[PDB]
Amino acid sequence: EERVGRRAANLRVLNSYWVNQDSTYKYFEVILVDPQHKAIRRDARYNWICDPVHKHREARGLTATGKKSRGINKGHKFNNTKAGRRKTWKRQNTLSLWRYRK
Amino acid sequence: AAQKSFRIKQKMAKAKKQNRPLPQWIRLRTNNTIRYNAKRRNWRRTKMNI
Amino acid sequence: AISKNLPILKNHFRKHWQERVKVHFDQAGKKVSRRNARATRAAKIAPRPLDLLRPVVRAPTVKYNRKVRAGRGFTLAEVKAAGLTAAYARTIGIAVDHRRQNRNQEIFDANVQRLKEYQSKIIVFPRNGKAPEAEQVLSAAATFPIAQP
Amino acid sequence: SEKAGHQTSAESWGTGRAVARIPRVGGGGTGRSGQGAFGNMCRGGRMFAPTKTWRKWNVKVNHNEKRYATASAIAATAVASLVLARGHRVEKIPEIPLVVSTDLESIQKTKEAVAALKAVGAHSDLLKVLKSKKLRAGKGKYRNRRWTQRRGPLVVYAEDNGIVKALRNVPGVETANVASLNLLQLAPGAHLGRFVIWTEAAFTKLD
Amino acid sequence: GKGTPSFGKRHNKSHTLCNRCGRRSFHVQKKTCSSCGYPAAKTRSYNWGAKAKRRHTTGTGRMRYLKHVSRRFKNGFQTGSASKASA
Amino acid sequence: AKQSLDVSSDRRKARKAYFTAPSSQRRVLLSAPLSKELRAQYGIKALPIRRDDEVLVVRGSKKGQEGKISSVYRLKFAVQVDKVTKEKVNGASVPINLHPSKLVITKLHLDKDRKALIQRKGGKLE
Amino acid sequence: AGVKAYELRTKSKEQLASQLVDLKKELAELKVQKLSRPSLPKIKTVRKSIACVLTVINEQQREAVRQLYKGKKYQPKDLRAKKTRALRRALTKFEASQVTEKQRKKQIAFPQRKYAIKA
RNA sequence: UUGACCUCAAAUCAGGUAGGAGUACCCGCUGAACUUAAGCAUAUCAAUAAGCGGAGGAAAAGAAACCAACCGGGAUUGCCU
RNA sequence: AUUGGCGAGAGACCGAUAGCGAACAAGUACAGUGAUGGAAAGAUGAAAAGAACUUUGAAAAGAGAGUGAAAAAGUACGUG
RNA sequence: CGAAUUUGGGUAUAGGGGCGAAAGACUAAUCGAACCAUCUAGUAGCUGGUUCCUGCCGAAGUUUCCCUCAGGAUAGCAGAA
RNA sequence: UGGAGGUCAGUGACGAAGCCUAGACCGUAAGGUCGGGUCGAACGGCCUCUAGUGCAGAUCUUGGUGGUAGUAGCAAAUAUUCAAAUGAGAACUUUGAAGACUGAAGUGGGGAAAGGUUCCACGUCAACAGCAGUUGGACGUGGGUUAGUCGAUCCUAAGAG
RNA sequence: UAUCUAGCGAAACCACAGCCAAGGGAACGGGCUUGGCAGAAUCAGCGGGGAAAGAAGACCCUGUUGAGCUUGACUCUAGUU
RNA sequence: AAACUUUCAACAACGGAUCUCUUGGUUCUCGCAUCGAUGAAGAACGCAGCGAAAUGCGAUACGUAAUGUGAAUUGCAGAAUUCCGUGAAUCAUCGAAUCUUUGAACGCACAUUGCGCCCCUUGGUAUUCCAGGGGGCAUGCCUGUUUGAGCGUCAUUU
């Protein structure tokens, strides 16, 4: 998803799926959606992806694979990675001092 | 260098215009902190490394 | 590096905690901003009560099952038993939980009674016409306090 | 600033250079080049133990402890001896606590409020303020604390019917709700016995 | 003589002027600037270079365009023109 | 005191605003109080200084000396009134800087915007 | 002295450009005269007048071009409004307010009601 | 012969879009070592700094393939515990 | 959440060897091939009223005179 | 001192790398591991320093253990409560 | 000692702080006070609070100043002298006269690299030239670089890309 | 050259300074004690002394400090099979 | 005895300590979201009557237009009934343009102000050569248009 995204930087990576596989390569068909095409800007069932917050969602790790890699799942299995392991790590390593010390 | 690039010869020009003393009517201006040409450069003292 | 009768003090500061310290000087400031946010939300959505109506549910675990508390929302079974539709309840300001299930009669009786006394205590403006001048109350939870059985 | 005394690339030359082991600025041809830095003893170096934000600024105090102090401060205002010692011109005041009619709460204009304060006996104290306005001693006078002055009577009310606005502008005298009754003005400088003017309603509400 | 006799042989130019950063830091044999990273599109800057960022950051120079955008947004990026003639 | 949070009671910020205010802001900072009579027939306590107004000096060494404005020297927060100079020992006459707050406006140069300036402040234009 | 913008806008194209040449001539006459006389600030006036004139010529042409492209799509990139790169890639107000038919059906059916409690 | 279609091209084709800056915060990847262990190798520093990629006013997460074992709670986030 | 940007307000903060490196033409002068390194330097007087003029000296300048409240404030200028 | 010659310009090799008719030589006065910046205020049982007065009390270099013998822990001596 | 709350309706342009004082007094001392001189704008006593709070040392940091000391030194490149002029002032400027030297792999005439206006003229000697200076590659003000043929541009080399 | 003069004019070093013998002393004192003695200020040399200066000794020891290198030290590892 | 050394005082020096001030910093809080292929950040070179900086700006160059204010700027010079005014200002505001050469830089290139090509137009006798002026020519990707390629393949036609 990343190499496709950086190749066609004018498209957002909707998803990707395994299509085939051999000894030394894996093959994926990457679903791309053009955010600057009026057809997709309209039909607000899909106009969420042309929102600027969704550009290059594969680089940030927001597609299905990105969610899997970061381990962003509900459960006790994912106690370290529930909202982002760096946020949780920063959450539980901060020294939260108050005006009136506890 | 007697055979110099033109972009060097622009470095040449502002070197010569800047290498002149502070105008003497600046003193007379009100609340003038400026006293002398601090950025003054001389070929005898320091090189301009282009 | 250890001496005398002193307790072993497990202090977790081997890390560079200094860059990650967060001191809450803004505790006073955030309180004023939050009160301002409550003020502006109430002014925006007046005269609705600035908050939803929560059901009264029994806390889990053996430790806290002796106390009821405001849950998330009324289960769909409770909403229909009050004589409503889930969508209509959301608009009129009733918090609705779809994933909670009613398995206790006493809790169910309290919630449907909570809804019935909520309906009789609110008024709803019509979509079309001159809405009656109503005075905004700011706390649905306070007007219907959670009661220990 | 956390990076004070550290926006530098200093590094010690070690021994064998007839100079101290304090780290020194590299480079050359600056005057700053080859100068000590990074230490607490160096010009331009960091301070020893840089002051940090997480120092305990506010102090927890037991609620019963604060209320205990407020009760003592209030009881001190009834002692005419303490008020005189604390520096309030109450020598000619016929009665302490000085209680006025509750109509003072309804006074809207500063002219009538100060006129009442003159008559009820707080005249001398109000003259002691607004004549003691002295320029603050020391570097604090250009940190927005330029002027110092004494504190006048503390007018205590029950319901702000305009008394707070009327006396808001008068130097020294400050208004305090009987419900609140903050200690920081009942015992300024931890000195008991602040001259307090009580209104009739606030006195009743006190019990 | 590795010193003053050798310093005499220093009459060439390892670096020349870089068209991007304008510093005398454009290596000639490497055909790349050592300060701004010319000709690479990304402007060479590192977090470990805390000061070097400060030297060549936004706000260092003129701000031809970015200077006015704060005012433009403040008014709302609004277009058109004013109406009232004069006093 | 300062109740509206927007205005600043900082000495440094107030002094910086004064010493770096532009020409437009300096004009209102160079306000001049009207005389007892000029107040009576206009009704305005003070008016911004103007290049062609007759003024009176009421404070300083120049106390009591009348004059007419020759140049509002806004750059120094000062005004240059005619006939009130100090002779340099060479014989040259250099004008005295004066702050307008120390001057009393004895007469007004009434231009049509000034007539609007008096009306907007509550003046009867007598 | 010097010419002023408001009367210039009245003048048509050809004579506005004609006087542009006139100002450019007289600026040249002062430019050669500046090196002779020790002080000549009048060049400032004509330089300012030149900028005023050709500012109007550029503006008049642009107003005509807007007239050329009035109400027709695909305005030239300099004529269309320069808001912000982020804004021009951002969704329009009509387009953000666009909703699917299923969503709009629910909105009309069950809108956010207005209500209050009489306590 | 002539029309298609499928795939793959070209065009200074019509219309668009990406790059770069900043980077305090945020999302990932990569990733040390000094240090501590009175030595040092697991460990620690640290799933950190540096490096790289990507956005916004916040971002991320987010409406359970959840926690529980209770008279059960009920998206996510944050604070006190 | 936020030590970036813009705007705003405060401080039991520092007060020109401090506080940002930078109160000032500061990331400036300057050094390095380069990556980079990187200073010092505030205050006359209310206002220049910045010492007209005379004399000695080639001149600087001094001595006088003079301004100025003060020249034990003369731009090498708060105090020293 | 006519060639394994010398030298100019261009060019290539970049740090655990380069190059070396080999000395651990040279690699911008830095070489048995360049320079620069950051992690970094790295570490140290080691050296030096450690800023006012007066009053009262006032030692120790020993026990045991330790990769311990330039140090700690423990007991001892001391002060204060 | 720096600052904070209170108080003395404290002190102060008729002089606060500061600084100097082989002048006085108090305290064992840390220090405090007063007198005298300069000085010009704020500053104290007491009850508490707070800290970036007390220096002789750290081959301490920065800045400055000493003895050394009018000392070492200004001794490679064989060497200068006389007169006149300018100029206040000449060992050093200019001219002339001599005397010399580099001795054509020169201290000459040009250039590549590099430098960048030093080239040239006029005015001038506050700094600089190791002494001096009237001179200057210094200071101030200006002037100065003309190409169809000289090169770059074009070509390719090792290479880079 | 040194020397002297005219002009210009540093640096190293420096607790304070600069007479010895003997004693003792941290066991080789300019200072302490006992004696000898001791008369301003100096100039040129000089090389006895100031355990003279130049470097937190480079030789040696210690450090639970490193680094270069080596190997049938221990543990791994690219590569290859 | 002087000279010299040492000590102290007065005055004078060297030096910038102390004290006082502060358009600066720092920390905290609050609010907002705002760069760029419509060309960003940065840089280079220029622009003022007399400017080297700083500040501002770009051959429209310490800026022009629009708006508000209402009579200046200021060191000198100059202009200044421009003054009862669509009108001064190194004014503010800022919505229109200009914005050199660059720079993600975008015709190729760059240690060069190099080399180009296309269109329109003006001139030199000129579709072709040389100039002038104006406008263009980057890469990747998307939608569509046109022209296409492939016995990949279908139908049709002898």
From Swiss-Prot, chain A:
<feature type="region of interest" description="Disordered">
    <location>
        <begin position="62"/>
        <end position="83"/>
    </location>
</feature>
<dbReference type="GO" id="GO:0022625">
    <property type="term" value="C:cytosolic large ribosomal subunit"/>
</dbReference>
<comment type="function">
    <text>Component of the ribosome, a large ribonucleoprotein complex responsible for the synthesis of proteins in the cell. The small ribosomal subunit (SSU) binds messenger RNAs (mRNAs) and translates the encoded message by selecting cognate aminoacyl-transfer RNA (tRNA) molecules. The large subunit (LSU) contains the ribosomal catalytic site termed the peptidyl transferase center (PTC), which catalyzes the formation of peptide bonds, thereby polymerizing the amino acids delivered by tRNAs into a polypeptide chain.</text>
</comment>
<dbReference type="GO" id="GO:0005829">
    <property type="term" value="C:cytosol"/>
</dbReference>
<keyword id="KW-0963">Cytoplasm</keyword>
<dbReference type="GO" id="GO:0003723">
    <property type="term" value="F:RNA binding"/>
</dbReference>
<dbReference type="GO" id="GO:0003735">
    <property type="term" value="F:structural constituent of ribosome"/>
</dbReference>
<dbReference type="GO" id="GO:0002181">
    <property type="term" value="P:cytoplasmic translation"/>
</dbReference>
<feature type="compositionally biased region" description="Basic residues">
    <location>
        <begin position="67"/>
        <end position="83"/>
    </location>
</feature>
<protein>
    <recommendedName>
        <fullName>Large ribosomal subunit protein eL15A</fullName>
    </recommendedName>
</protein>
<keyword id="KW-0687">Ribonucleoprotein</keyword>
<keyword id="KW-0689">Ribosomal protein</keyword>
Swiss-Prot record, chain B:
<feature type="compositionally biased region" description="Basic residues">
    <location>
        <begin position="6"/>
        <end position="19"/>
    </location>
</feature>
<feature type="region of interest" description="Disordered">
    <location>
        <begin position="1"/>
        <end position="21"/>
    </location>
</feature>
<dbReference type="InterPro" id="IPR023626">
    <property type="entry name" value="Ribosomal_eL39_dom_sf"/>
</dbReference>
<dbReference type="GO" id="GO:0005737">
    <property type="term" value="C:cytoplasm"/>
</dbReference>
<comment type="similarity">
    <text>Belongs to the eukaryotic ribosomal protein eL39 family.</text>
</comment>
<dbReference type="Pfam" id="PF00832">
    <property type="entry name" value="Ribosomal_L39"/>
</dbReference>
<dbReference type="GO" id="GO:0005829">
    <property type="term" value="C:cytosol"/>
</dbReference>
<dbReference type="GO" id="GO:0022625">
    <property type="term" value="C:cytosolic large ribosomal subunit"/>
</dbReference>
<dbReference type="GO" id="GO:0002181">
    <property type="term" value="P:cytoplasmic translation"/>
</dbReference>
<comment type="function">
    <text>Component of the ribosome, a large ribonucleoprotein complex responsible for the synthesis of proteins in the cell. The small ribosomal subunit (SSU) binds messenger RNAs (mRNAs) and translates the encoded message by selecting cognate aminoacyl-transfer RNA (tRNA) molecules. The large subunit (LSU) contains the ribosomal catalytic site termed the peptidyl transferase center (PTC), which catalyzes the formation of peptide bonds, thereby polymerizing the amino acids delivered by tRNAs into a polypeptide chain.</text>
</comment>
<dbReference type="InterPro" id="IPR000077">
    <property type="entry name" value="Ribosomal_eL39"/>
</dbReference>
<keyword id="KW-0687">Ribonucleoprotein</keyword>
UniProtKB/Swiss-Prot annotation, chain E:
<keyword id="KW-0694">RNA-binding</keyword>
<keyword id="KW-0863">Zinc-finger</keyword>
<dbReference type="GO" id="GO:0030687">
    <property type="term" value="C:preribosome, large subunit precursor"/>
</dbReference>
<dbReference type="InterPro" id="IPR018267">
    <property type="entry name" value="Ribosomal_eL37_CS"/>
</dbReference>
<protein>
    <recommendedName>
        <fullName>Large ribosomal subunit protein eL37A</fullName>
    </recommendedName>
</protein>
<dbReference type="GO" id="GO:0000448">
    <property type="term" value="P:cleavage in ITS2 between 5.8S rRNA and LSU-rRNA of tricistronic rRNA transcript (SSU-rRNA, 5.8S rRNA, LSU-rRNA)"/>
</dbReference>
<comment type="function">
    <text>Component of the ribosome, a large ribonucleoprotein complex responsible for the synthesis of proteins in the cell. The small ribosomal subunit (SSU) binds messenger RNAs (mRNAs) and translates the encoded message by selecting cognate aminoacyl-transfer RNA (tRNA) molecules. The large subunit (LSU) contains the ribosomal catalytic site termed the peptidyl transferase center (PTC), which catalyzes the formation of peptide bonds, thereby polymerizing the amino acids delivered by tRNAs into a polypeptide chain.</text>
</comment>
<feature type="binding site">
    <location>
        <position position="33"/>
    </location>
    <ligand>
        <name>Zn(2+)</name>
    </ligand>
</feature>
<feature type="zinc finger region" description="C4-type">
    <location>
        <begin position="18"/>
        <end position="36"/>
    </location>
</feature>
<comment type="subunit">
    <text>Component of the large ribosomal subunit (LSU). Mature yeast ribosomes consist of a small (40S) and a large (60S) subunit. The 40S small subunit contains 1 molecule of ribosomal RNA (18S rRNA) and 33 different proteins (encoded by 57 genes). The large 60S subunit contains 3 rRNA molecules (25S, 5.8S and 5S rRNA) and 46 different proteins (encoded by 81 genes).</text>
</comment>
<keyword id="KW-0699">rRNA-binding</keyword>
<keyword id="KW-0689">Ribosomal protein</keyword>
UniProtKB/Swiss-Prot annotation, chain F:
<keyword id="KW-0689">Ribosomal protein</keyword>
<dbReference type="InterPro" id="IPR008991">
    <property type="entry name" value="Translation_prot_SH3-like_sf"/>
</dbReference>
<dbReference type="GO" id="GO:0022625">
    <property type="term" value="C:cytosolic large ribosomal subunit"/>
</dbReference>
<comment type="subunit">
    <text>Component of the large ribosomal subunit (LSU). Mature yeast ribosomes consist of a small (40S) and a large (60S) subunit. The 40S small subunit contains 1 molecule of ribosomal RNA (18S rRNA) and 33 different proteins (encoded by 57 genes). The large 60S subunit contains 3 rRNA molecules (25S, 5.8S and 5S rRNA) and 46 different proteins (encoded by 81 genes).</text>
</comment>
<dbReference type="GO" id="GO:0003735">
    <property type="term" value="F:structural constituent of ribosome"/>
</dbReference>
<dbReference type="InterPro" id="IPR005756">
    <property type="entry name" value="Ribosomal_uL24_euk/arc"/>
</dbReference>
<dbReference type="InterPro" id="IPR041988">
    <property type="entry name" value="Ribosomal_uL24_KOW"/>
</dbReference>
<keyword id="KW-0963">Cytoplasm</keyword>
<dbReference type="GO" id="GO:0042273">
    <property type="term" value="P:ribosomal large subunit biogenesis"/>
</dbReference>
<dbReference type="GO" id="GO:0003723">
    <property type="term" value="F:RNA binding"/>
</dbReference>
<keyword id="KW-0687">Ribonucleoprotein</keyword>
<dbReference type="GO" id="GO:0005829">
    <property type="term" value="C:cytosol"/>
</dbReference>
